[PDB]
C-alpha cells in the first residue's frame, strides 16, 4: 500500500533553497537504473519532507525536486 511519510528518502538529502525549481511531477528517489539521486531541494517546503513509500521505493512530494 502507498504510504504518506514525512521523512527523507534513503540515500537522499533535501535542501530548502530559493534556487530550487518549482513544484512538478512526483519523482522517485532512484532512477530507472537504480541509481540514487542524492541531493534534492525545495523552495518553501518544511522538513521533514513529504514522501511516498510505494512498491518500487521512495517518491518525493511535488514540491521536492532534484538539485541539478
Amino acid at each position, epitope marked *: 500500500e502507498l504510504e504518506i511519510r514525512f521523512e527523507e528518502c534513503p540515500g537522499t538529502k533535501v535542501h530548502v533553497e530559493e534556487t530550487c525549481g518549482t513544484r512538478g511531477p512526483s519523482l522517485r528517489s532512484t532512477t530507472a537504473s537504480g*541509481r540514487v539521486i542524492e541531493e534534492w531541494c525545495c523552495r518553501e517546503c518544511t522538513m521533514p519532507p513529504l514522501s511516498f513509500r510505494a512498491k518500487d521505493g521512495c517518491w518525493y512530494g511535488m514540491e521536492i525536486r532534484p538539485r541539478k
Partner: antibody, heavy 120, light 112 residues
Framework: EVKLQESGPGLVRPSQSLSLTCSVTGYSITSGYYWNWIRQFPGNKLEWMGYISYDGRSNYNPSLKNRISITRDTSKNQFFLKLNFVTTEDTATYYC?????????????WGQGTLLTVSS | EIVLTQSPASLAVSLGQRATISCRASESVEYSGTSLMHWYQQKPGQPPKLLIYAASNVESGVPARFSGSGSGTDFSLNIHPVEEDDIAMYFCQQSRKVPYTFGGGTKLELKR
C-alpha cells in the same frame, strides 16, 4: 553519497578460510538493494558469486554452493564474502556491487576492488 | 547457466571511427518485453562502470556517443565517434537468470 568499499587480507594460504568485507556508505543495506560479490580472475573473466538482499535473503552461484556464505552486519552496515576454503584458483580481484530491486537489475554501484592472492 | 559469447576478443579502431561490439546469449534474455542485458566499460585498475542497461538505455552521465541495440539473444554496443577516453575493456552481462553471467570482454585498442 553512496559508496561501496572492499577490504581484506590480500594474501591467504591455500586451504585456509577467506572473509572479505564491503562497507557501505550513504545508504542502509536493509533497504532497496541486493548486495553482490563479483570477482575478476587474471585474464579478466568476471564471475558473479552471489548476493544478499535487503531482507537478508541470499542466493549463490552453484559453482560455489559448497564453500560460500554472504553474511551481513546491519549495525555496521557491511556485508561479507565468506569462503570456507580457498585454492590457488581463487586468486582474483574481488568486487562488491549492488543493484536496485525494482529495475532491470544493472550493477549501478561498484567498489574499488581488493586484490587477493592465494599462495603457499 | 546462460552463456554470453562476446565478439571480437579485441578490436583496433582509429579516432572518430565507429566501433561496434557484439554479445550473443545461449538463450533468450527477454522478460516481460524487457532485455535484461547490460553493458559495462572497465579501465585498467578500476571497477566496471555501467554504460547501457536494459540493452538500449544510456545511463546518466554516459556520453551520447554510446548506444546499445538488440533483443532476444543478440545485442550490440556502438561507439561513434570513438574518442581517446574510450580505450578500455567492455563487458556484456545478463540478469535474466541466476547465476548472473558476463561475456568474456572485448579489449578496445586505438590506432595511430
Amino acid at each position: 553519497e553512496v559508496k561501496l568499499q572492499e577490504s581484506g587480507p590480500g594474501l591467504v594460504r591455500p586451504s585456509q578460510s577467506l572473509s572479505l568485507t564491503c562497507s557501505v556508505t550513504g545508504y542502509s543495506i536493509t533497504s532497496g538493494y541486493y548486495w553482490n560479490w563479483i570477482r575478476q580472475f587474471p585474464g579478466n573473466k568476471l564471475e558473479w558469486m552471489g548476493y544478499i538482499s535487503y531482507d537478508g535473503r541470499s542466493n549463490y552461484n552453484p559453482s560455489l554452493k559448497n564453500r560460500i556464505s554472504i553474511t551481513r552486519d546491519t549495525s555496521k552496515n557491511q556485508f561479507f564474502l565468506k569462503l570456507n576454503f580457498v585454492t590457488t584458483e581463487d586468486t582474483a580481484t574481488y568486487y562488491c556491487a549492488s543493484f536496485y530491486y525494482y529495475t532491470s537489475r544493472p550493477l549501478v554501484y561498484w567498489g574499488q576492488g581488493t586484490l587477493l592472492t592465494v599462495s603457499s | 547457466e546462460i552463456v554470453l559469447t562476446q565478439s571480437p576478443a579485441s578490436l583496433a579502431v582509429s579516432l572518430g571511427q565507429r566501433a561496434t561490439i557484439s554479445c550473443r546469449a545461449s538463450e533468450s534474455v527477454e522478460y516481460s518485453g524487457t532485455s535484461l542485458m547490460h553493458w559495462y566499460q572497465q579501465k585498467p585498475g578500476q571497477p566496471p562502470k555501467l554504460l547501457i542497461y536494459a540493452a538500449s538505455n544510456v545511463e546518466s552521465g554516459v556520453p551520447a556517443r554510446f548506444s546499445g541495440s538488440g533483443s532476444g539473444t543478440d545485442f550490440s554496443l556502438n561507439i561513434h565517434p570513438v574518442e581517446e577516453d574510450d580505450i578500455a575493456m567492455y563487458f556484456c552481462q545478463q540478469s535474466r537468470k541466476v547465476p548472473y553471467t558476463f561475456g568474456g570482454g572485448t579489449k578496445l585498442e586505438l590506432k595511430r
